[PDB]
From a paper:
We determined the cryo-EM structure of the RVFV L protein in the apo form at 3.5 Å (L proteinapo), which resolves the RdRp while leaving several peripheral regions flexible. This apo structure aligns closely with the previously resolved RVFV L protein structure (RMSD ≈ 1.05 Å), with positional differences located in the vRNA-binding lobe (secondary binding site and template exit channel) and in segments linked to dynamic domains (ENDO and C-terminal). The most notable difference is an ∼20 residue register shift starting near residue 1451. Both the RVFV AlphaFold prediction and the SFTSV (strain AH12) L protein structure indicate a loop in this region, whereas the prior RVFV model omitted the loop and threaded the sequence into a neighboring helix, producing the ∼20-residue shift. The RVFV L proteinapo shares a similar overall organization with the influenza virus polymerase subunits (PA, PB1, PB2) − and other bunyavirus L proteins, ,, reflecting their common evolutionary origin. The catalytic RdRp domain (resembling the PB1 domain) contains the conserved thumb, finger, and palm subdomains seen in SFTSV , and La Crosse virus (LACV) , L proteins. In the RVFV L proteinapo, the finger subdomain adopts a more open, inactive conformation than the replicating state observed for SFTSV. The PA-like region also encompasses the vRBL subdomain, which provides viral RNA binding sites. , Notably, the 5′ RNA hook–binding cleft is closed in the L proteinapo (preopened in SFTSV , and LACV L proteins), whereas the 3′ RNA secondary binding site is disordered. The ENDO and C-terminal domains are highly flexible and unresolved compared to SFTSV and LACV L proteins. ,, Together, these features show that bunyaviral L proteins depend on RNA-induced conformational flexibility and structural rearrangements. The RVFV L proteinapo structure provided a framework to map resistance mutations selected by EIDD-1931 and 2′-FdC.
Author numbering: 214 to 373, 412 to 1318, 1337 to 1351, 1364 to 1370, 1374 to 1405, 1451 to 1572, 1579 to 1599, 1608 to 1626
Write the structure that this text describes.
Amino acid sequence: LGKTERELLAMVSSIQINWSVTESVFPPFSREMFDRFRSSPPDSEYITRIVSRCLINSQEKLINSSFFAEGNDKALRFSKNAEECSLAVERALNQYRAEDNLRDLNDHKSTIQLPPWLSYHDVDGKDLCPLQGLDVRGDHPMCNLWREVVTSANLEEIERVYIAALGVNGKKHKADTLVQQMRDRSKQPFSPDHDVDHISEFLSACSSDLWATDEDLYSPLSCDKELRLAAQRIHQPSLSERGFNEIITEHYKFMGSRIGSWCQMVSLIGAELSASVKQHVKPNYFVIKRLLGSGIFLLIKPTSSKSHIFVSFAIKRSCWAFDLSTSRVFKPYIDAGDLLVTDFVSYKLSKLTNLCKCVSLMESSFSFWAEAFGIPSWNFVGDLFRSSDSAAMDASYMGKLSLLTLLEDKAATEELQTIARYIIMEGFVSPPEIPKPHKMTSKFPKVLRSELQVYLLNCLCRTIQRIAGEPFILKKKDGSISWGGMFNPFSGRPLLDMQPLISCCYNGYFKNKEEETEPSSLSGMYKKIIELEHLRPQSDAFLGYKDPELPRMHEFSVSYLKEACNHAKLVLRSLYGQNFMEQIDNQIIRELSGLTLERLATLKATSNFNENWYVYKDVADKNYTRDKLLVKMSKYASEGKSLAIQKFEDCMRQIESQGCMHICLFKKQQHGGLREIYVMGAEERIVQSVVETIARSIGKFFASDTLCNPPNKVKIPETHGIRARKQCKGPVWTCATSDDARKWNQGHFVTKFALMLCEFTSPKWWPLIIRGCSMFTRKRMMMNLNYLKILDGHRELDIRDDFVMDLFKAYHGEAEVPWAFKGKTYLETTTGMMQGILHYTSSLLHTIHQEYIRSLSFKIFNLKVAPEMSKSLVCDMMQGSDDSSMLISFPADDEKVLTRCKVAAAICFRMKKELGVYLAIYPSEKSTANTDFVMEYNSEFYFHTQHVRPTIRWIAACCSLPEVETLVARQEEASNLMTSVTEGGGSFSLAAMIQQAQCTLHYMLMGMGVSELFLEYKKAVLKWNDPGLGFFLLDNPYACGLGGFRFNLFKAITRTDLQKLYAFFMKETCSVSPGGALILSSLRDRLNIWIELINENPEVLYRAPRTGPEILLRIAEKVHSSLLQKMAAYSGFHGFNDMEPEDILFLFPNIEELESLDSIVYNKGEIDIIPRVNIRDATQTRVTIFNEQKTLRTSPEKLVSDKWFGTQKSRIGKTTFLAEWEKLKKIVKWLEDTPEATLAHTPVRNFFARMESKPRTVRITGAPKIAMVIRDNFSRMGHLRGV
């Protein structure tokens, strides 16, 4: 044992338990609890009683649910089920109808609040000259308003960013208060029986005009043809001579389409509004603007609300060509003669982000949906024009639905869309169970806000009725498992491919990754913390003292927990032998040894919440600020502490002085997952880090735990079939179920975690554990200060939500609740887990529960059917945080045995859910039971052999503009998103289309279509084609998303003039990019506690730190990890430079893999693809940098550190080590046997420390060697030829 080990052990022994303070501050913890728990063995009789009761309950529930009482035929049972489903649906609909002040059935509100106009080009520029000389007619208030506007323009009274500053007749629509009242009059809920016929008409209809690309429509975003041509020339110089390839050709064709023109128009509207809102220059005036080179005019007003912007659109009659569609879906307009005008429209500041990215998102969505149904991605628009099959209609329908939901961008619509997943997954339930889709009826939104929601609800109701009437039919022959009767949840048309169906289910995920707040309507978050707290038992007798007979919320059985612990210990003894305890001890010691201050010292966030912020009145003006972990961790390390454990004890003492958690909350405004964030203090962070480290250490030993063994997640299902065939020794039958927990986060008490953790650890860790858990028994959560500011001055009748009423009454002292206090600024809670702050421990608890239920399932099969079947059946677990899955496989030779097996498997599936209660594992309605050859886990679906994923989840994510910083940073993160989507199961051609979308978005970001000056910029950037100036690099279409930004840069430098610039740096100014690019683009004071110091001791960069100052150096290096003017400045770079392979080697250490890919993907010309036949098995494959001959015996870093410092971690022969060193030396010319000579000779230490890259490993899912992957994964409709 090293010095670190012995000193850590000595310190840990120095930590001691203080029972008095813990008992006093934290009620439910006591010496007697743990003493009795460790001493008393579990009550076998009680366990047997509860197991028998669960068996009886499961049998009764199965009999009653499936209507086996009379032994009726399938027909009558299904009729009864349909009757029940209809009754439930009618109940929900009537409950909706019971509301008052319902919106009238005919009061149509357009889902899209924009005109359907489509027009030609006009005079360029942003000037308002075209307004002059227009004779507008009409009498509508907007007609008169725009008449005044044109009169002022003719009189040239418009100021300058043009400001109208109109006078009389400016009121009666703008009284500074009218409009904000008007759009406030849209609070009436929508009836379920509202007329929504026009939505259905628009969605599914003979809509072919949408895809006719002619007439020279307005298209401001088609001015970058030369740039795309140059980009294509990089990879396909021969083809580029002829012209654009297929992908760019169809991209520009889609630009030229009617929908393309409209999408570009709306995107320009979004960008213009986003620019306008930043001005805030009008005293009390209006601001008028004109779109670039078009007859579109926007009359804009921001109000005193500072959260809504009011717009009025106008178009010249002479320029207006026609309308995209005459349906009510779009905002109706008013004729005024020379002009067509619409009414004022209010927009929230959040939607503008969606508006700007409309065109790219829609190109992506349409391409993906066309690809999913079999239409080639690179040739779809024409196919959409000649709609001749159900596939084309379905694709168009889904694209239009994406349009509607994106333009509506309301969360409730997204949840309604996502519910379809669980609605339709019910159709795979095999006998003896029957599908119960109607059980999701309780998940509908409380209120209806839009016509689109009504239409979606009606579609969902029809789908539920249809599914409950008749499940999907199975078809088995010669190992060719298949299903029949599937249909789209929304359109209702038949389907035959799993992938489009799953994509339909997951359509509600359009992650845009907005890392900001969301003040409006966040009470639900707070509500989500309270709903269970009031249900806490008044007595703690069932929180770890005794065993409840009928468990309630938050209660659990001590004896069952101890029995599960004993069973898990027995399993571990069987697996790892008798000395498993000491192995665990060594593992945890090793894990804590490597738990340094540095690894926690990441940006993330921290809460400065102390007692100073308890009273709202004291702090009303000071703005709360979230500190970074960096400063606090650095301050702690400056004291001279190396390991994060070192500062545990003292830190907890501070917490013990506080006696409560000091958590703060954060709501992300992104429309998807991980909205909840529980930011938490430094001392809490260190303690929780220790606890989670030990939890993960203990849990790693269990194979079935996916969290601790991510490889096992993909390993287990694939090997399941092979193991089943080996064991059963013949044809097999598989049953399965996927389950999700109900109120997992706020349903758990904390004592059980401490108990079970102590059962698996030696006594010396006990004080570390019981203390570290007790701090969760009382937690105070801050709220948003603006929320309280609003609440204080809101008086009564705030909102109909009872939670807000209760909070208001408690804050003013009118009412008393245990989760709030008068005049305070926090919610106090005794239970909870704060959304994954205690993550590994929960997984361990789930793991042990599943091991016990596995044993019980073995017993049940042995009992109910035949004694000896345990020797010839397979059972498999999968668990994570809260999602779980159960797999069972048995021989399928005898029909009677097969039926008995199915009955027993259903019984065991119900057993798991029923018994989960005793450990406070509450099953959710989302769980699906007894589905044959169907399995779900983390949204990954396993339809027998096929393994499918919801690729759409990553589509919308690929289109975003976060992280700003440098342009090259933006491009490389775009490449990262491309890698993410392609590894998600998409085809390469679809990836190329997404890259085109990203290209157009990125180019319009610099102002393409916004400012005339962009035309000058194009003139310059073309000459130098440097990404540092914003030039976008299109990857080779055949292998886009695989080679990545490194491939793009390598190809660029290989032949283009760009290399001449890089050699200029080898012989405004900024440093190199992480990708290696010498870019140019266009806190530290607080960390007062270095390059020369690192140079003096490079070993710091090559080993884990053991002292303070080195930790400071490591965090320090972690911290430091105009356009016309700039092109004018570049005129001085006339230095004559040439090629140099050594510079390429320095920039790219992995040249061999890059050229290997190049040898296949370079200059492939046109595309010829042979269509495939039916479906094939999905096979995992290793693709890139798999070889080790060129990648050396071990990593270059290991060899360098062994040579310079003798770390002897290479574990190779001495002569082998010398040979490896010599071959590296001939690889690396400037590498020397000493750090000093190497530093002097090479053309600081950090820059040459990380140049050893060793890129990551990539795996792909082929559908039957890099050539194989590229030929079989370019497109899903076929495979390449000649490769």
